[PDB]
Amino acid sequence: TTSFSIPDVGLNGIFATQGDISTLSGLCRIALWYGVNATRPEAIGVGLPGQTA
Amino acid sequence: TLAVDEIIETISAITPMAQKAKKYTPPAASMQRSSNTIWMPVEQESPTQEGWDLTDKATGLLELNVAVNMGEPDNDFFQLRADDLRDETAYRRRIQSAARKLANNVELKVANMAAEMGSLVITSPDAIGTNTADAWNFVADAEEIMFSRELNRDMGTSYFFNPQDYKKAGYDLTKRDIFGRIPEEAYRDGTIQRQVAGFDDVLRSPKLPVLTKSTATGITVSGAQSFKPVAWQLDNDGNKVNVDNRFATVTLSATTGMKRGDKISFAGVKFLGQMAKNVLAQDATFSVVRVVDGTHVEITPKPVALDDVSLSPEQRAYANVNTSLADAMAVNILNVKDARTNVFWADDAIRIVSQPIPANHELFAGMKTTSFSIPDVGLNGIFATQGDISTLSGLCRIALWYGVNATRPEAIGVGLPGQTA
Amino acid sequence: ALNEGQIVTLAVDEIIETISAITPMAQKAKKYTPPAASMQRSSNTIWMPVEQE
Amino acid sequence: ADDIPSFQNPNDWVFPWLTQDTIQIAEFYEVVEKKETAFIYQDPVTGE
Amino acid sequence: ENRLESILSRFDADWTASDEARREAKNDLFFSRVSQWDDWLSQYT
């Protein structure tokens, strides 16, 4: 494994590789672990235009 | 009982053909995309006319090409176990045996390709010890056919005997009742000479294949066929796809008993002088490369005819046979008995395309890959090891990627002695 | 003419960019990073206090 | 000053700490070695 | 081709190259300066 940086957003992931000798192949995996949590739903809002019956 | 790590050495081989053949390593990045095949042009031949008023008779241009590609890797996958003490001492020697085996396999492929794609065939009606200087005559026939065909021999020429016929040649040399320098060398050692009848290197190769007899009989060309030199052709989508110059598919009456490597010759066609286009007295000989379908075969020297009228002049510039196929001519078979072959060639007719196996990349992390030099021959493969998830074990893989290509089948030859019966 | 020579096919490595995206929402959201191996796949929840009324 | 900058935050969320700062920016120094023109004047006093 | 792209490519290379050494050093600084008990999964259970 090694670290993997993501553009734009300031997140860091993991970059892992593995080699298989039998088939002479390689697996590569990029994993990113995060959670988007809204701690104040009363502060988050939504605007809906054109709500006609 | 006491095992004693005192190796009883038992085998010792040699790879003359493989260490002699030229080696080519094209750029891997381009060869990945080009489907592991590349194209190489062929020396140009010019048509010629004589006269004063040559209006509307201006020829075009035409340059032919050959395609060289690669096969599949030759591995030595094996499993290594610690906690054995018999896989501790055996592994160190298993690596070396693997290297020798891979070199031997490369040489075997080279010899087989040369023997089954050598267009020029020199057949003899009896064994080599039948007459005096008969081995010299056998080598000189090959030299004479190369000279008459006027094939490029700047790089060199080489003749490979099998042990049987090499010993017969040495016996012929020693029986002379005269001892100068050549008979004394053929007495003290088995060597005939390092150069015989004009060849620049006359060796003996123990792994020369045996060309089994052909049970093909009563075969005739089915319908007139004209083969035209070409450098590409249109595919179904309108694209231009290159054409390999070293093959021609003929339609016979019945291709029963033929196989890859059969030496044949049609009745009536004769070799030309290539450059001068003068008709030789020899029968043009071809080699069966593939038995496709049941009434078609694929012979390696494309029989461009000199008297063909459907050939545009720049195509007729490449003629190497005096007459085309005449829809009933008998196709005689030249290998009528089982005989281990003697193989001659020009040194620039066989190449060994090689590629790498990039197992040192970041992708193949966890398996340790180093280079691995195959001895004798000039080739490099990979040596990769990786352990198991548990149980204190491992795996080893010695891999080598190459492909043996015969770019000049008309310059590769075959010698078949004792072709009676 | 009829220069019936040898035909190849070219591939140039001047790529043609076609996608161009922006992430204002994720740039505006505040990124928090627990240290090293702070929380595992099993327990990754966190309880934070709410300002007292 | 209206556009608050952001960069890879080099610190980690220390749970027992009430407040951590959130403004980040980067200073990127790079060095270029090149052959540039130099003038050999003659000193009005002495030397060059 | 973008100047920012080249700068950030170099920075990402260096940042991902010096990762584990930086995190070990940060751990050592925290251990030596704030607390020797970084047991944060527990300490709350």
Side-chain angles (χ1 to χ4, degrees):
Chain A
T1 63
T2 183
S3 171
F4 187 70
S5 74
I6 286 304
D8 275 10
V9 316
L11 310 169
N12 283 316
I14 213 186
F15 175 89
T17 63
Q18 176 161 248
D20 194 6
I21 197 186
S22 316
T23 87
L24 259 192
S25 318
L27 277 171
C28 178
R29 162 141 181 202
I30 295 128
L32 188 104
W33 198 27
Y34 67 101
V36 188
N37 34 45
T39 49
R40 305 186 34 209
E42 76 261 17
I44 299 157
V46 155
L48 300 159
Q51 300 283 322
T52 66
Chain B
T1 59
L2 326 168
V4 295
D5 333 309
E6 220 236 330
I7 282 285
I8 308 284
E9 284 140 285
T10 40
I11 66 195
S12 193
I14 187 168
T15 67
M17 281 195 238
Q19 97 193 330
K20 169 162 316 285
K22 191 208 92 142
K23 316 214 171 42
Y24 183 40
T25 322
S30 78
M31 205 186 216
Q32 185 195 271
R33 260 153 158 93
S34 69
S35 156
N36 270 108
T37 167
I38 54 178
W39 297 84
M40 319 174 17
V42 189
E43 293 104 54
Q44 220 152 313
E45 308 228 62
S46 154
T48 279
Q49 58 221 15
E50 270 302 316
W52 279 107
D53 173 82
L54 294 186
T55 68
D56 281 321
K57 295 206 211 100
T59 87
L61 284 101
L62 159 67
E63 182 159 37
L64 324 171
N65 34 24
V66 314
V68 281
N69 56 331
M70 273 201 344
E72 49 192 7
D74 206 7
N75 309 267
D76 178 61
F77 206 35
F78 74 88
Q79 159 147 28
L80 156 80
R81 258 278 310 170
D83 198 345
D84 223 330
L85 194 58
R86 291 314 286 275
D87 293 7
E88 145 164 24
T89 47
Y91 160 80
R92 162 202 336 145
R93 313 137 173 197
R94 180 63 175 263
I95 302 299
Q96 293 174 340
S97 320
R100 299 181 323 226
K101 203 52 206 297
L102 289 200
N104 161 283
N105 286 159
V106 152
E107 149 85 0
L108 256 206
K109 306 282 271 215
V110 172
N112 275 47
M113 191 92 188
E116 325 177 291
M117 285 210 44
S119 151
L120 306 175
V121 191
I122 303 293
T123 56
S124 165
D126 46 53
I128 274 183
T130 297
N131 305 334
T132 170
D134 195 10
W136 183 94
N137 234 318
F138 212 72
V139 188
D141 268 297
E143 140 75 15
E144 171 246 335
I145 199 52
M146 311 215 88
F147 178 80
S148 311
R149 300 261 323 137
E150 330 169 22
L151 300 168
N152 190 252
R153 306 175 296 165
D154 306 74
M155 287 325 118
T157 42
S158 304
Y159 202 101
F160 308 94
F161 272 112
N162 39 4
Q164 271 323 305
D165 293 290
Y166 204 87
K167 192 257 291 181
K168 297 210 204 103
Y171 188 32
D172 172 39
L173 256 185
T174 70
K175 217 144 35 164
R176 281 317 169 72
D177 292 49
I178 199 188
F179 274 52
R181 164 191 61 120
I182 302 187
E184 281 153 68
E185 251 171 349
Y187 191 88
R188 295 266 302 210
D189 321 324
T191 88
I192 39 184
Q193 272 315 280
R194 276 322 284 189
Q195 291 107 20
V196 175
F199 276 86
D200 300 337
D201 219 352
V202 181
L203 319 96
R204 82 171 151 187
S205 177
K207 334 173 177 313
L208 270 157
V210 55
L211 196 55
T212 37
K213 101 175 177 319
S214 204
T215 36
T217 37
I219 311 185
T220 50
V221 182
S222 168
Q225 292 141 34
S226 169
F227 296 117
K228 318 169 193 71
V230 79
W232 51 254
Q233 44 180 44
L234 264 43
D235 79 4
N236 326 74
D237 213 335
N239 305 332
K240 284 178 281 215
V241 287
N242 291 324
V243 185
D244 219 7
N245 191 38
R246 334 159 311 186
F247 300 109
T249 324
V250 277
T251 315
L252 302 152
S253 72
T255 83
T256 71
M258 311 215 188
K259 62 221 159 296
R260 162 146 161 96
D262 264 13
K263 310 304 176 210
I264 70 193
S265 151
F266 310 97
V269 316
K270 308 263 195 212
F271 268 145
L272 284 192
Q274 212 56 39
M275 171 65 98
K277 306 289 190 264
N278 72 288
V279 178
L280 289 194
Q282 323 274 10
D283 263 8
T285 64
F286 308 88
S287 199
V288 166
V289 161
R290 224 164 62 77
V291 172
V292 50
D293 208 280
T295 51
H296 301 73
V297 302
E298 172 146 39
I299 52 188
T300 206
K302 180 180 290 197
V304 189
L306 178 81
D307 55 41
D308 206 328
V309 289
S310 52
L311 287 183
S312 165
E314 57 278 50
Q315 311 198 316
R316 206 146 31 217
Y318 293 93
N320 57 63
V321 164
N322 76 325
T323 285
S324 34
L325 311 188
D327 81 40
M329 47 183 22
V331 52
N332 331 305
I333 320 289
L334 270 42
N335 53 316
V336 293
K337 291 190 39 68
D338 307 77
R340 206 174 321 262
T341 59
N342 319 276
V343 164
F344 56 96
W345 66 35
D347 263 359
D348 59 76
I350 287 284
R351 77 202 39 238
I352 307 177
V353 190
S354 159
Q355 271 324 278
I357 296 145
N360 42 289
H361 195 246
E362 320 155 9
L363 221 51
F364 317 88
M367 105 189 179
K368 163 177 341 187
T369 301
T370 77
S371 196
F372 189 78
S373 147
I374 303 312
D376 215 46
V377 299
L379 296 152
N380 207 243
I382 68 137
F383 173 45
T385 85
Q386 88 163 9
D388 297 82
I389 194 193
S390 47
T391 200
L392 231 53
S393 307
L395 284 169
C396 261
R397 178 135 152 192
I398 295 152
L400 179 63
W401 207 6
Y402 68 99
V404 172
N405 282 273
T407 51
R408 309 183 40 204
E410 81 265 349
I412 310 184
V414 152
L416 296 171
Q419 282 325 299
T420 183
Chain C
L2 172 131
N3 176 33
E4 215 255 10
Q6 318 210 351
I7 292 311
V8 310
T9 88
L10 254 289
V12 185
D13 290 273
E14 65 195 59
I15 39 164
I16 322 166
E17 285 97 2
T18 43
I19 312 184
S20 160
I22 195 192
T23 77
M25 302 215 58
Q27 287 168 17
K28 252 263 170 197
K30 218 76 61 194
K31 269 75 64 166
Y32 291 71
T33 281
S38 166
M39 40 196 57
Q40 53 203 130
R41 212 76 139 80
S42 318
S43 95
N44 44 44
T45 201
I46 274 174
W47 298 85
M48 332 164 46
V50 168
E51 156 168 330
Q52 274 214 229
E53 283 148 88
Chain D
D2 320 325
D3 184 52
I4 286 142
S6 100
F7 208 58
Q8 282 243 25
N9 182 301
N11 322 303
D12 292 325
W13 189 14
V14 178
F15 297 133
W17 283 0
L18 226 66
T19 286
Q20 303 214 148
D21 47 26
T22 165
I23 313 272
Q24 262 102 29
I25 211 169
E27 264 159 80
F28 190 81
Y29 313 85
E30 83 188 278
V31 185
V32 181
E33 184 156 24
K34 276 200 318 220
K35 272 163 133 28
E36 40 198 273
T37 318
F39 286 171
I40 291 266
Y41 277 92
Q42 162 142 331
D43 209 9
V45 181
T46 171
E48 64 280 11
Chain E
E1 205 280 318
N2 206 13
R3 163 136 200 90
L4 177 58
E5 277 290 27
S6 81
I7 279 173
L8 280 192
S9 86
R10 263 125 72 196
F11 164 73
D12 282 315
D14 319 334
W15 183 267
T16 55
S18 55
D19 201 49
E20 66 282 336
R22 154 192 335 122
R23 295 213 278 249
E24 287 189 39
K26 285 218 301 270
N27 196 349
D28 291 2
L29 266 189
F30 205 87
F31 179 94
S32 184
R33 270 156 173 211
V34 169
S35 149
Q36 319 210 315
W37 281 96
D38 306 327
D39 186 18
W40 283 318
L41 262 194
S42 41
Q43 259 186 57
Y44 295 125
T45 83

